[PDB]
């Protein structure tokens, strides 16, 4: 037994607007004591990331680089979502004495590995959430004293970021699904995100021991008009300019999932040209979805003398038979005009016919946009809505930002608006950027909720389920958890 294992899976999903989305996912498990000093020999788990867990006491780390914005209202709900720019949140171990020093050192170390400007994380853009961003792995106690979070909304994701990312994979772009990752195709898209997640998980079914899991993910969306404008179907060759020829020799599971469910008709499926190995039916995000499975380890599918090119017929469905809009989506904008005063507004939609559900809202604002909290208003259907929980942290000039956290119950079939006034500040002449007439950015806001489900889901075992079904722990079979991000805002100063 090697004591460590690797799995890889690609999922392809047509979208209600006529676009096509793809997600790559690589996962490794290791039965080792990484939390304590002493491990010196590495095989499948990368050495660059493996020695950070002990040097800086880390329980969980999450890092993402993204361009674009996910259009929930027109694309549907995603498996995973990230804000524009770069975000980083970390859970530390309770033995850590000074969290700020370790947080600064860790950000500086990560900036070297991932070729990003993470050294710009400081006290003016770091918060400590009190009810959001709970652990995603095995946890005993949750004291938010040990959690940090930050976002840089103007960071750029280009090939220079993808080169280190591909360097940490074991087959390293020379075998398996990794041969499809070509930069020019990957950036000719409407959405692009790269992510890394580290957390501890159960070692076996009884779950009395710990194992450490690393997960690397990449997701893109291909637009219909710009890409694949012609009547030719969505094949692998036209999306990635490459076909699949052979499996990674180090992986124990390697497969491609194609979503072939048709909402309008009954027991009718989309057409996939190569006959698949198997079909898989399950409840995903509160809906019964059907997938076609191509098993790359089968020698019926892929051999030395014949490779794989999958083809899929999909066009934007007629106005009738289109899927209904999701039960939750949101928007954000700036009100007013001039260079003195303004307002920040958020709109929250509940499109469910008869059920009301609560949401948790987290907002962070820079110190230069001074906020007046006696002007905060929340209105649903023309009546005032009183939040159950509210936490406010005021800003200090050049020291810390604003933080606002609310818990609001949303009435059914309605839209709710949240607003607050601000005033702009005049800075010193040395505190502006090289291009001072462009403006400043307010980071995107976070929304978390438990959305009701159409169908009830059965309990699932993480070692026998697809990788896209085991990202969030499930507490009840009648709801599911979502975390949404709005868009960033651009504001000018005198």
């Amino acid at each position: 037994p090697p004591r460590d294992s690797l799995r890889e899976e690609l999922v392809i999903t047509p979208l209600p607007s006529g676009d096509v989305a793809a997600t790559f996912q690589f996962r490794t498990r290791w039965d080792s004591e990484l939390q304590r000093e002493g491990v010196s020999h590495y095989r499948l788990f990368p050495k660059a990331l493996g020695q950070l867990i002990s040097k800086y006491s880390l329980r969980e780390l999450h890092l993402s680089f993204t361009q674009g914005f996910w259009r929930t209202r027109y694309w549907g709900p995603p498996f995973l979502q990230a804000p524009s720019g770069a975000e980083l949140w970390v859970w530390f171990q309770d033995t850590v004495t000074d969290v700020d020093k370790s947080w600064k050192e860790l950000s500086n170390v990560l900036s070297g590995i991932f070729c990003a400007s993470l050294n710009f994380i400081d006290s003016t853009n770091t918060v400590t959430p009190t009810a959001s961003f709970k652990p995603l792995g095995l946890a005993n106690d949750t004291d938010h004293y040990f959690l940090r979070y930050a976002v840089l909304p103007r960071e750029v994701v280009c090939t220079e970021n993808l080169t280190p990312w591909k360097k940490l994979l074991p087959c390293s772009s020379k075998a398996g699904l990794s041969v499809l990752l070509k930069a020019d195709r990957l950036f000719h898209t409407s959405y692009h995100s790269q992510a890394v997640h580290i957390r501890p998980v159960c070692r076996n079914a009884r779950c009395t021991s710990i194992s450490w899991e690393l997960r690397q993910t990449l997701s893109v969306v291909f637009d219909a008009f710009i890409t694949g404008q012609g009547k030719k179907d969505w094949s692998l060759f036209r999306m990635f300019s490459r076909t699949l020829t052979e499996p990674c020799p180090l992986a124990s599971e390697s497969r491609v999932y194609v979503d072939i469910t048709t909402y309008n008709q009954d027991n009718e499926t989309l057409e996939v040209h190569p006959p698949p190995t198997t079909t898989y039916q399950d409840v995903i995000l509160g809906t019964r979805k059907t997938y076609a499975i191509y098993d790359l380890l089968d020698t019926a599918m892929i051999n030395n003398s014949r490779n794989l090119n999958i083809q899929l017929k999909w066009k934007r469905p007629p106005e009738n038979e289109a899927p209904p809009v999701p039960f939750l989506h949101a928007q954000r904008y700036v009100s007013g005009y001039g260079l003195q005063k303004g307002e920040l507004s958020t709109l929250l939609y509940n499109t469910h016919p008869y059920r009301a559900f609560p949401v948790l809202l987290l907002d962070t604002v820079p110190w230069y946009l001074r906020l007046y909290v006696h002007t905060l208003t929340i209105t649903s259907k023309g009546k005032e809505n009183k939040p159950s929980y509210i936490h406010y942290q005021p800003a200090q000039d050049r020291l810390q930002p604003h933080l606002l956290e609310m818990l609001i119950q949303l009435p059914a079939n309605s839209v709710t608006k949240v607003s607050i006034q601000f005033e702009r500040a005049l800075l010193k002449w040395t505190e502006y950027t090289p291009d001072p007439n462009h403006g400043f950015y307010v980071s995107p806001s976070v929304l978390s909720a438990l959305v009701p489900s159409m169908v009830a889901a059965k309990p699932v075992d993480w070692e026998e389920s697809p990788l896209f079904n085991s990202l969030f722990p499930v507490s009840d079979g009648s709801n599911y958890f979502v975390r949404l991000y709005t868009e960033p805002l651009l504001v000018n100063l005198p």
């Binding site: 898209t189 904008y333 005009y337 507004s345």
Partner: protein, 208 residues
């Protein structure tokens, strides 16, 4: 300004027949309706690949107007958004066609739709583009701007907006009532004697 002075653009537009046919179909529908054809505009806007939205507005005038023959005015505005593929929704440019009740500017609408169909298939946009058609000549524009910035400057009533595209940087209005032209005329003066930046006029003259 070196951002525009040091660059060059190679045009490749070719949609004349489509613009003509759009204009002919728009004029007939407006004849039948007696006002702005809204369903046709929405369907046609969706066919070329935009996100479409509408807005209703109304107001009461201080006294009856002889020049335009209005006392109490109600109408609807239709606008469509093109989202920049490789960016977020932070900045936007506006192209608008103001329609009156005098059966004019059909060719402007046709050209607008053809230009949207040409623009939809590119990758190099760094800003969103809004394509706007208003109901009454300058009351619709005022209603749309007031609803967009969420300010009640005049007292006009409206339905709330559902789609926005960030901060607006520049705008261009087009008026055209013939298939051919002999010249193009430009206007710069605005309300209360305010003026735009001279660089916009220099650009227009550079493309002339």
């Amino acid at each position: 300004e070196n951002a525009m002075g040091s660059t060059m653009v190679e045009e490749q537009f070719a949609g004349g027949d489509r613009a003509r046919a759009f204009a002919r179909d728009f004029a007939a529908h407006r004849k039948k309706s007696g006002a702005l054809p809204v369903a046709w505009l929405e369907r046609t806007m969706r066919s070329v690949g935009l996100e479409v939205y509408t807005q209703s507005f109304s107001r009461k005038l201080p006294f009856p107007d002889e020049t335009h023959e209005r006392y109490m005015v109600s109408g609807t505005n239709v606008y469509g958004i093109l989202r920049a593929p490789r960016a977020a929704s932070t900045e936007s440019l506006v192209l608008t066609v103001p329609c009156g009740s005098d059966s004019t500017n059909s060719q402007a609408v046709g050209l607008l739709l053809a230009l949207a169909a040409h623009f939809r298939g590119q990758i190099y946009w760094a800003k969103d583009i809004v394509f706007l058609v208003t109901e009454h000549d300058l009351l619709g524009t005022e209603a749309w701007l007031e609803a967009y910035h969420d300010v009640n400057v005049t007292g006009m009533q409206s339905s709330p907006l559902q789609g926005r595209a960030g901060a607006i940087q520049a705008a261009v209005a087009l008026e055209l009532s013939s298939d051919v032209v002999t010249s193009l005329d430009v206007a710069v003066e605005g309300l209360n004697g305010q003026l735009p930046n001279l660089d916009l006029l220099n650009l227009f003259q550079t493309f002339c």
